[PDB]
Amino acid sequence: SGLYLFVMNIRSVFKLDELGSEVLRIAVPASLALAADPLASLVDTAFIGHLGSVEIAAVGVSIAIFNQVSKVCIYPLVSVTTSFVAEEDAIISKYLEEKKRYIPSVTSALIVGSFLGLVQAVFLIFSAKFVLGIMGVKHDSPMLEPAVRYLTIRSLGAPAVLLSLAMQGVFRGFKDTKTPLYATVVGDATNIILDPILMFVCHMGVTGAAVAHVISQYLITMILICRLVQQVDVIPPSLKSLKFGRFLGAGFLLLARVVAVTFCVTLASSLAARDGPTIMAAFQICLQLWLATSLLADGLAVAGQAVLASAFAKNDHKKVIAATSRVLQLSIVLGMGLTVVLGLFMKFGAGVFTSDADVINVIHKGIPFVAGTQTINALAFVFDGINFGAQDYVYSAYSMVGVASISIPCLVYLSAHKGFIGIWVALTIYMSLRTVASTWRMGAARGPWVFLRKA
């Protein structure tokens, strides 16, 4: 059994050797870029918070529209490209040939991102009134006008947004998270700078905030594409040299997988909402705490994926094994550390979020789940990176379908029976199912780990 990989070289968890330096070198910048958007967006939130009462709820619903539409079109387009570029960049016979280099995954991802980005752009421009009526914004309500304005304008950035996300998948294929991190920082500072200039000095309000974000997003796309064309070639030499069927298929497998994962969390929230606003608010806080702390290991999972995708591309079973073990031990360490920190923060900083004693008390009731399964969470996310470095997409798809089929009845039953604590028990069952699904793929020496029966 492949479970021994969890403890192999455990005297070298923190060693800054080639593997340790590389994993740290790939993982830390990605985490930083994932952490830079929330802070820059919170600065944006502040600027809009000084506009008016309708504008936040107007812009906020407009933003809620974008963020989910993207997450559908983000996770596949980036997790497929990080592996399909890291594969083709690791066997492209690269040598002292001067004529840069064409990678079909790089060209394929840019096309898919550009198409989806303009498609989302047009769609959210024309169905703005429609989606907003869907989004609980009444048509007679005052929110609808600035929401439509901000939505329609910010949808100009949708092409650049999805294109730069494809390019982050590309640059992750090259094991370069610094380039997306630099681009993200640059755009976010520019947007934090452009927000007061346009919203307030130009008297544009929600139009100003949207123009600030769109200009900054197109700057980030520009930065990424200049660095990307200087490193490799993005034009295909012939129109037949584009690997597309394989590309879109992994994307749709990962898209179906994400739909299931997000729907499990969607049901939990829609079930907590049926338990009074106190349970409503407390579960929402717990859930953001739960998931946000999992988002740290996301750079670690990218490093593991890129390294394993490059290594599986070169028949290098020895580094595959070392890197798998390394990121796995790092993930469990981070999970336990986040367990400690998040539990402590929840008990003594609930009052940072809410001024309600009831909400804080329910938050304190739920601390064990949100804090306990943090090691399960880190393992679940890092194994996704690992099994994506193994490029096991059909298993991911059908395994999450099964985890949801087991977890969704758990949610419904446990929630209606024991409310807040029952939803959290169900979510623990689901996360334990997730972790066990991914770990079985590796440890059982089945699929992309069949070679383990020979080591």
Author numbering: 56 to 510
Provide text from the study.
HvAACT1, belonging to the MATE family, transports citrate from the root cells to the rhizosphere, where it chelates toxic Al ions externally, thereby conferring plants’ Al tolerance. While most structurally characterized MATE proteins transport cationic or aromatic substrates, HvAACT1 is unique in transporting anionic substrates. In general, MATE transporters share a common topology consisting of 12 transmembrane helices (TM), which form quasisymmetric lobes: the N-lobe (TM1-TM6) and the C-lobe (TM7-TM12). Our structure-based mutagenesis work identifies the citrate recognition and proton binding sites in HvAACT1, which are physically separated but functionally conjugated.
Here, we present the crystal structure of HvAACT1, a citrate MATE transporter from barley (Hordeum vulgare), in its outward-facing conformation at 3.2 Å resolution. Removing these regions (Δ1-56, Δ153-199) and introducing five-point mutations—C351A, C388L, T495V to enhance thermostability, along with R105H, R456S to reduce surface entropy—successfully enabled crystallization of a modified construct, hereinafter referred to as HvAACT1cryst. Functional assays in Xenopus oocytes confirmed that HvAACT1cryst retains citrate efflux activity comparable to the wild type, suggesting that the truncated N-terminal and L2-3 loop regions are not essential for citrate transport. The crystal structure of HvAACT1cryst adopts a typical V-shaped outward-facing conformation, similar to the previously reported MATE transporters. The twelve transmembrane helices of HvAACT1cryst form two distinct lobes: N-lobe (TM1-TM6) and C-lobe (TM7-TM12). These lobes make tight contacts on the intracellular side, sealing the transporter’s internal cavity from the cytoplasm for approximately 15 Å. The electrostatic surface potential of the inner cavity in HvAACT1cryst reveals a positively charged C-lobe, attributed to three basic residues: K126TM2, R358TM7, and R535TM12. Conversely, the N-lobe cavity is primarily negatively charged, owning to a cluster of four Asp residues (D92TM1, D99TM1, D289TM5, and D296TM5). Despite 0.1 M citrate in the crystallization buffer, no electron density corresponding to citrate was detected. In the HvAACT1cryst structure, D99TM1 forms a carboxyl–carboxylate interaction with D296TM5 at a distance of 2.7 Å, similar to the D41TM1/D184TM5 pair in PfMATE.
